[PDB]
């Protein structure tokens, strides 16, 4: 009321806990796009990467208060944490952080779902489909395809290989 | 046979059942228009606002139908059952009567999920969500935002209110 | 080294200090933007003018950040704080909310600029002053160039005159 | 008389002295860029990247002598020292001596900057920041990311790496 129906206060709660962990991966891609901005290291590429992946995540974030909001649920914002690292390492030790990170989104993504169906929220779960899970799967594949391409590059000509993948894959 | 599969009779007589909802509802929504463009009423963006409703119910009712017949379901028609009213008051009560009959379609959906759901046809599921589900939820949340638009105006000005509503958001 | 000339450690903190504050306000005028569009508050102009300003605040933490990395600082990212409040109230008391913030931004520029003073660092001055002072000043006088509209508005038809504010103001 | 306001012997001294050491550098940079044309260096991408910088001293001294003029001081020209080096070795050497050259801009744009705020020249420090004092962080900013990249390329598959930059990051 005045809207309000078939949703649960433990998906609005869940909903706004997903919002908290997409604002979280937002800075944490701020964090990462600007570290590669530093002039010891320097690749521009890397950085753009990043930040459309920050990008991303702010978008699915208001995606879901939106959705928040046309379901007649509330909104309730929490402490943001700082990323887990203030240095991020070489290129793929960024990539490999990328990926869990994901991977953890793509998770809390599953277990709304599970919430959702587990509540009869047949629309939360088309929701979710049409809208985060396939995109994360994308993702989660890009950055697979990304990590092997500078694994391969980075053994064991190391900084060549990071040159170059920045400008010939992240660059491109 | 020839065509038929996965589809049963239960979920095709729901179908049927929602179609004559879906049409009640179009009908409503017609009877709504035309009170508002009586002379002693007299508020066009209202009339709009309804006679666009209508369409959309309409079309839901044959969007329905055609999914029936591409199933191999037989479409089954039955007396369209007059609206609720003659006359329907001032804006805000045409609202609430908007409100509680999308919310009543809405719950029809919701319980034809269901069906879809324990009957195993997960392509109905699929069909529901993406083509009517999300259509009124974003539906409810314009009209929640229409009454409490509204109510904030007629309190206690209400004539006034009334026509700054239908020309300020209305006639937009 | 390899690039860092006349750029102080105390500087480099507030900087990242300055960041942290631009985010922060950032996030309040997020929370803002969304309590406008619940369905029972339902302003969409006050909504859009918010996230707006959500987007200045975070484009300027990014001008700040790209600046100390072409200074040869480092950025250093902290928890982000929640916004103050979860219920934002009226028109004007979100109104009176953002000029709060706006000033506390614009105190903690002047502070920084007397410590890059202090520290004679004469292009973070300039740096400052063309990319954020001025535009915290003009900012400041149509937020309080707002408030006075909806105080006069609100003195004493307050639904009718937040509507009117909400549709003639900000919606234009 | 007939023009001159508020502008020191000092500061008209200070200027032509910043003068030819623009010159001088915009000197440094044409014998830095003809060497990468010899036949037996051969990198077309540091010819033209060299090029460009003399170009943008020679602009600057140029944007001096027009302030000079503007204020009504007098421009006096002495000579220009030629270049540190005949031969400047690989593309990291190169680099390396253009960040030395442009710190030492630098550091005489501050040094200039503090004589015109001890001169309580207002007009001169806003000169110098908005056409001097940020074009070099930027340029300085530029410099350092390039010497990254061709260290991290140098290391230690030295010709290739040095083919490569030029090709990749110099020639784009
Ligand atoms: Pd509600
Ligand atoms: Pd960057
Ligand atoms: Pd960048
Ligand atoms: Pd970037
Ligand atoms: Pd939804
Ligand atoms: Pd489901
Ligand atoms: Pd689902
Ligand atoms: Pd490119
Ligand atoms: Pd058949
Ligand atoms: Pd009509
Ligand atoms: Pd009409
Ligand atoms: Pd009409
Ligand atoms: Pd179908
Ligand atoms: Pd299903
Ligand atoms: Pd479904
Ligand atoms: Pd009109
Ligand atoms: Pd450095
Ligand atoms: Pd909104
Ligand atoms: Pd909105
Ligand atoms: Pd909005
Ligand atoms: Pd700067
Ligand atoms: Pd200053
Ligand atoms: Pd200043
Ligand atoms: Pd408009
Ligand atoms: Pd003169
Ligand atoms: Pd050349
Ligand atoms: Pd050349
Ligand atoms: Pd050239
Ligand atoms: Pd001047
Ligand atoms: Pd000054
Ligand atoms: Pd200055
Ligand atoms: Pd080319």
Same mark, same amino acid.
């Given at each position: 009321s005045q809207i309000r129906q078939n949703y649960s206060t433990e998906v609005e709660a869940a909903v !706004? %806990?997903? +919002? !908290?962990?997409? =604002?979280?991966?937002?800075?944490?891609? =701020?964090? =990462? &796009? $600007?570290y590669?901005? @530093?002039?010891? +290291?320097?690749? *521009?590429? +890397?950085?753009? $990467?990043? %930040?459309?992946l920050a990008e991303?995540?702010? *978008? &699915?974030?208001? @995606?879901?208060?939106?959705? #928040? !909001? #046309? %379901?007649? &649920?509330?909104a309730l914002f929490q402490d943001l944490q700082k990323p887990s690292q203030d240095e991020w390492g070489?290129?793929?030790?960024?990539?490999?952080?990328?990926?869990? /990170? *994901?991977?953890? /989104? !793509?998770?809390?993504? /599953?277990?709304?779902?599970? =919430?959702?169906?587990?509540?009869?929220?047949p629309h939360l779960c088309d929701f979710l489909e049409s809208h985060f899970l396939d995109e994360e799967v994308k993702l989660i594949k890009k950055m697979g395809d990304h990590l092997t391409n500078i694994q391969r590059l980075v053994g064991s000509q190391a900084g060549l290989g990071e040159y170059l993948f920045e400008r010939l894959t992240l660059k491109h």
């Open positions: !706004n %806990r997903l +919002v !908290n962990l997409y =604002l979280r991966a937002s800075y944490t891609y =701020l964090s =990462l &796009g $600007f590669f901005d @530093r002039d010891d +290291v320097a690749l *521009e590429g +890397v950085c753009a $990467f990043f %930040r459309e991303e995540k702010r *978008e &699915g974030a208001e @995606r879901l208060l939106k959705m #928040q !909001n #046309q %379901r007649g &649920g509330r070489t290129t793929p030790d960024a990539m490999k952080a990328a990926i869990v /990170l *994901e991977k953890s /989104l !793509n998770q809390a993504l /599953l277990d709304l779902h599970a =919430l959702g169906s587990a509540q009869a929220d």
